[PDB]
């Protein structure tokens, strides 16, 4: 069993520089009379599920919300059990 | 002791009256049976010895060497079967006759209650080996090698003979038992110094000592496979056996006289180990490794302590087996490639995997991996040397490091990497060759289960 499903490529016209740091690169290059030719070859790295980013502290706090909720529930349960 | 000597003599009429196509089978079967018979001399005593008669006696130094000598002949026959296939029947029978004569001389040499009888047989071994090297060797240098191998030996052996007869004129006997029981101190005199040198140099040249080791790479590179096997396994150990036997009458002069030989050995082991690192020939590399191991054995015998003697015995047996295996592996490569150059045939692990396993095991045992008997002897000698002087540990550790280095270098150069493209005649390894390697290696790993059998009379 292997992956023989006839994968097709997306549309090359989809990749655009707008809304990406490549746009800033192109704008900065234009101030010197230059232009970036391979920009759209790099656009897919900022387009889909790769568009949203997380910070370092956000990465370290990957599951702090659920753990904190469980901690509060547990400490409340212990408080209501010991005080009996 | 005749129960071993007579069957060895009967090997000759059985060989010469055999059929043209039955010589190898019969010789191998009866040599294996003789080995089985000789295996019952390992039952030694903590008392004196097994004094069979006035002429022959057995010792726990003699018995392991005798068993190894008997066990080596069948392996030599198996190894010689291949390259002697296109040979006439008479000349094959003559080759087998040389092998049988060499075994008989070695067996009588190792028992030999007399020092003159020991000398006579010790030198009688010189003739069949010389014929084997100069007759069935491939290269044009074999003759030269034989010359070296001869004269070196005699250069040391004629003075010994003189000293020997001189001793009997003063002591009245050369029997090992009377010599040991009636030993008297040797005064620090010029006459006694030269008597000491005459007694030692004959066995020193055969180890070989580092200064006098030039004949050995020549003889091993030039000799056929069986010649190399017997030279590396048994003939080098004659010097160690003789030194252990004869140093009993050389005290206390050994304390002063041993210094030059100790320095030569401790530095030449480093020298020959480093030589092994830059060697373009497998046989030459294995010969230099043998020189290093025998340098360690010389140090052990010169230190002359119980642990030294135990380690020397263990190392002699272990090196005999390991070096014979290494020569056999190199010869299996040579019979395919016809070059004997290490760099030529490469990446053989991909083409011959089981033979690569044999190479790995042989390299590991040459490297002295515990708890192999190679390391048992190495460690006992090293501890004795440390007690002798704590600074020897530097040279011993350097020797261990360099030994590991060239052993794994030899393994990696031949077995690892990419195969040579233009070599296409590499056939699958034969059952004969695999069985030869197994019959070398299983006895070593069995001996590590019962080390006291090879630790000598001081155990």
């Amino acid at each position: 069993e292997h992956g023989h499903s006839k994968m097709e490529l997306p549309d090359y016209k989809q990749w655009k520089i707008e809304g990406t740091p490549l746009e800033t690169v192109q704008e900065k290059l234009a101030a010197r009379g230059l232009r970036d030719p391979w920009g759209r070859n790099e656009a897919w790295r900022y387009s889909g599920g790769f568009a949203n980013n997380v910070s370092f502290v956000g990465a370290l706090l990957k599951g702090f919300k659920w753990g904190f909720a469980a901690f509060v529930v547990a400490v409340g349960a212990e408080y209501y059990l010991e005080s009996q | 002791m005749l129960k071993i000597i007579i069957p060895t003599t009967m090997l000759l009429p059985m060989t010469w009256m055999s059929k043209h196509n039955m010589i190898w089978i019969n010789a191998t079967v009866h040599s294996l049976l003789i080995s089985l018979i000789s295996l019952s001399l390992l039952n030694q005593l903590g008392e004196n010895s097994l004094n069979f008669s006035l002429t022959f006696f057995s010792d726990s130094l003699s018995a392991p060497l005798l068993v190894l000598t008997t066990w080596l002949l069948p392996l030599m026959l198996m190894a010689s079967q291949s390259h002697l296939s296109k040979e006439t029947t008479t000349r094959k029978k003559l080759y087998i006759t040389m092998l049988i004569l060499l075994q008989l001389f070695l067996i009588m040499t190792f028992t030999a209650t007399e020092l003159i009888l020991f000398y006579i047989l010790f030198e009688a071994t010189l003739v069949p080996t010389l014929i084997i090297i100069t007759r069935w060797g491939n290269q044009t240098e074999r003759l030269n090698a034989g010359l070296y191998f001869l004269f070196y030996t005699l250069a040391g052996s004629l003075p010994l003979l003189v000293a020997l007869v001189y001793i009997q004129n003063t002591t009245g006997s050369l029997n090992f038992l009377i010599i040991h029981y009636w030993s008297h101190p040797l005064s620090n005199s010029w006459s006694n110094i030269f008597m000491w040198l005459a007694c030692i140099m004959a066995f020193m040249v055969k180890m070989p000592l580092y200064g006098l080791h030039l004949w050995l790479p020549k003889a091993h590179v030039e000799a056929p496979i069986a010649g190399s096997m017997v030279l590396a396994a048994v003939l080098l150990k004659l010097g160690g056996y003789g030194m252990m036997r004869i140093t009993t009458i050389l005290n206390p002069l050994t304390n002063y006289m041993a210094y030059p030989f100790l320095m030569l050995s401790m530095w030449g082991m480093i020298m020959t180990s480093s030589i092994c690192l830059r060697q373009t020939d497998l046989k030459s590399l294995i010969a230099y490794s043998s020189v290093s191991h025998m340098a360690l054995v010389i140090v052990a015998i010169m230190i002359q302590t119980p642990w030294s003697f135990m380690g020397a015995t263990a190392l002699m047996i272990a090196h005999g087996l390991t070096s014979s295996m290494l020569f056999c592996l190199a010869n299996t490569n040579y019979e395919r490639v016809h070059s004997r150059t290490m760099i030529l045939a490469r990446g053989l692990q991909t083409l011959l995997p089981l033979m690569a396993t044999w190479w790995l095991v042989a390299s590991l045992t040459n490297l002295a991996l515990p708890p192999s008997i190679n390391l048992i002897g190495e460690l006992f000698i090293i501890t004795a040397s440390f007690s002798w002087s704590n600074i020897t540990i530097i040279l011993m550790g350097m020797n261990m490091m360099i030994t590991a280095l060239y052993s794994l270098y030899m393994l990696i150069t031949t077995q690892r990497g990419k195969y040579t493209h233009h070599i296409n005649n590499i056939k699958p390894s034969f059952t004969r060759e695999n069985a030869l390697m197994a019959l070398h290696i299983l006895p070593l790993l069995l001996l590590t289960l019962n080390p006291k059998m090879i630790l000598g009379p001081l155990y």
Partner: protein, 55 residues
């Protein structure tokens, strides 16, 4: 629970005059603590290898 400590000298290998060599195992705190950890790590590593070295 109790702190049980042992030495197990089971097989006597060669004896060298006054020196005796034997197959002996020390089962102190270090051994009985490190063996389970190493076994657990090796178990995880082998399970990982059946996926990593499949080809």
């Amino acid at each position: 629970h109790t702190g049980q400590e042992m030495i197990i000298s089971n097989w006597h290998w060669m004896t060298l005059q006054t020196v005796e060599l034997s197959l002996s195992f020390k089962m102190d705190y270090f051994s009985v603590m490190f063996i389970p950890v190493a076994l657990f790590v090796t178990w995880s590593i082998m399970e990982f290898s059946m996926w990593y070295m499949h080809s």
